[PDB]
Every structure is written in structure tokens, then in C-alpha cells.
Amino acid sequence: GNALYFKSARNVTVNILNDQTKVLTQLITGPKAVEAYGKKFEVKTVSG
Amino acid sequence: TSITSDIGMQFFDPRTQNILFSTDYETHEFHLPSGVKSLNVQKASTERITSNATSDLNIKVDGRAIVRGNEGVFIMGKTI
Amino acid sequence: TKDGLRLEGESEFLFPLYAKEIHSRVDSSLLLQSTQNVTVNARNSDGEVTGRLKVGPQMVEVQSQQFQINSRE
Numbered sequence: 001g002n003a004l005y006f007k008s009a010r011n012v013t014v015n016i017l018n019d020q021t022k023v024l025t026q027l028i029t030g031p032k033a034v035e036a037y038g039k040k041f042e043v044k045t046v047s048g
Numbered sequence: 049t050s051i052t053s054d055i056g057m058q059f060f061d062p063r064t065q066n067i068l069f070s071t072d073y074e075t076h077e078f079h080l081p082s083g084v085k086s087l088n089v090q091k092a093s094t095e096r097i098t099s100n101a102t103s104d105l106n107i108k109v110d111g112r113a114i115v116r117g118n119e120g121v122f123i124m125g126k127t128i
Numbered sequence: 129t130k131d132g133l134r135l136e137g138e139s140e141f142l143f144p145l146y147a148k149e150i151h152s153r154v155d156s157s158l159l160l161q162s163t164q165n166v167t168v169n170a171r172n173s174d175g176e177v178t179g180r181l182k183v184g185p186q187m188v189e190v191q192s193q194q195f196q197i198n199s200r201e
């Protein structure tokens with residue numbers, strides 16, 4: 001019955017850190033560009 | 049950075065309201081992107097294959113080459 | 129606790145939340161779900177939401193002026 005949100009006045013820099021706190025994949029939703037850094041990308045369907 | 053759904057990925061610039069990229073292929077037709085080095089398509093309908101004015105075409109294949117001329121073949125060249 | 133405070137219960141915030149860094153536990157994977165949709169938003173200096181990463185009921189939408197993909201380098 002409600003929509004969970006995430007907001008900010010700036011970038012939302014979703015990232016992942018290894019045990020050494022080093023970035024491996026990143027997803028930065030900024031004001032102008034939505035970057036998806038990483039080692040890959042995929043889009044699958046339900047059946048695979 | 050995996051994604052998953054029944055329909056798929058989407059993106060449209062809100063300053064045009066035009067779907068700049070989608071993955072429901074039946075609806076929006078795919079177009080060739082710019083800056084492509086090679087493309088490996090499993091079936092091609094090519095009217096003509098030609099090189100540029102510098103180097104040689106090389107129809108090279110590890111598999112077998114089966115060229116079939118339904119109305120006939122014509123080989124024109126200097127040293128054949 | 130001494131260095132922090134551990135909570136094992138459903139901390140329903142009946143009013144908004146604010147923070148700077150939202151983490152997940154080391155031994156458990158963060159999950160975030162709903163029934164209608166989940167929205168990530170980002171705003172300009174005038175508060176105008178300009179880049180949206182929306183996971184709608186059926187299929188994802190990204191709304192922005194650009195959509196890059198790079199490697200780690």
C-alpha cells in the first residue's frame with residue numbers, strides 16, 4: 001500500500017565493496033547520467 | 049549488474065519522451081549503432097561485399113566454403 | 129552497546145528518515161522490496177528530480193539525459 005523511495009539532493013552512488021573496501025561494480029544515478037560501472041551487464045527474461 | 053523481468057530494460061530521455069533504448073524487440077525495431085568494429089550475425093542478406101581501395105578482401109573460413117550460383121558464376125580476374 | 133546499538137525488531141518509522149551512508153550487514157545480503165514499485169531519485173540544486181532508477185511493477189525504467197556503461201577502469 002505504499003511506495004518505498006530513495007531521494008537526495010545529489011548523486012545516489014550505489015556501490016559494492018570487497019573485503020579491502022575497493023569498488024568492483026558501481027551504479028551512480030546522477031543528475032544527468034546514469035552510469036553502471038562494473039565488469040559486465042545483463043538483461044535476462046524469466047525463462048532464461 | 050544483472051536485471052530481470054518479463055519485458056526487460058528500458059530508457060528514454062525525458063527531454064524528448066522518445067524511447068532511446070528498449071529490449072522488447074517485437075515493439076521497437078533495432079538499429080545499427082555507430083562505431084562498430086565487427087558484427088557476428090548468424091544470417092546475412094548482402095547485395096554486395098567489397099573492400100576499400102587499399103587492401104584485399106579475404107573470404108577466409110576454418111569451415112568449408114559452398115558458393116552456389118543458381119543462374120551461374122562468372123570469375124573475372126587477371127591471375128586466377 | 130558500547131560502540132553502537134543493536135536492534136532485533138521491526139523499527140517502523142512513522143515519519144521520514146535521514147542518513148548519509150546506508151550499509152548492509154557483512155554476513156547478510158540487503159533486500160528491499162514492495163508491492164507497487166521502488167524508486168531511487170536524485171535531484172538538482174533546485175530540488176528537481178532529474179535521474180530516476182525506477183523498478184516498476186513489470187519492467188525497469190531509467191530516466192536521464194545519458195546512460196553510460198564502462199569498465200572498472
Ligand SMILES: *[C@@H]1O[C@H](CO)[C@@H](O[C@@H]2O[C@H](CO)[C@@H](O[C@@H]3O[C@H](CO)[C@@H](O)[C@H](O)[C@@H]3O)[C@H](O)[C@H]2NC(C)=O)[C@H](O)[C@H]1NC(C)=O
Binds near residue numbers: 001
Ligand atoms: C508506484 O507506486 C506508487 C505508490 O503506490 C504509485 O503512486 C500512486 O499513483 C496513483 C495514480 O496517480 C495515485 O492515485 C491518485 O494520485 C493523485 C495524485 O497524482 C491523487 O490526487 C489521487 O487522490 C489519487 O491518490 C496514488 O495516490 C499514488 N500513491 C502514492 C503513495 O503517492 C505509482 O503510480 C506507482 N507507479 C506506477 C507506474 O503505477
Ligand SMILES: *[C@@H]1O[C@H](CO)[C@@H](O[C@@H]2O[C@H](CO)[C@@H](O[C@@H]3O[C@H](CO)[C@@H](O)[C@H](O)[C@@H]3O)[C@H](O)[C@H]2NC(C)=O)[C@H](O)[C@H]1NC(C)=O
Binds near residue numbers: 011028031035
Ligand atoms: C555525480 O554524478 C555525475 C554524473 O556521473 C558526475 O559527473 C561526472 O563526474 C566525472 C568525475 O568527476 C567527470 O569526469 C571528469 O572529467 C574531466 C574532464 O571533463 C576530468 O578532468 C576529470 O578528471 C574527471 O575525469 C565528468 O565530467 C562529470 N560529468 C558531468 C556531466 O558532470 C559527478 O562527478 C558525480 N559527483 C559525485 C560527488 O559523485
Ligand SMILES: *[C@@H]1O[C@H](CO)[C@@H](O[C@@H]2O[C@H](CO)[C@@H](O[C@@H]3O[C@H](CO)[C@@H](O)[C@H](O)[C@@H]3O)[C@H](O)[C@H]2NC(C)=O)[C@H](O)[C@H]1NC(C)=O
Binds near residue numbers: 100101102103
Ligand atoms: C582501407 O583499408 C585498409 C585495410 O583495412 C585500412 O588500413 C588499415 O586501417 C586500420 C584502421 O585505420 C589500421 O588499424 C590501426 O592502424 C594503426 C596504425 O595504422 C595501428 O597502430 C592500430 O593498432 C590499428 O591496427 C590498420 O593498421 C591499417 N592497415 C594498413 C595495412 O594500412 C585503411 O585505413 C583503409 N582506408 C580507408 C580510407 O578506409
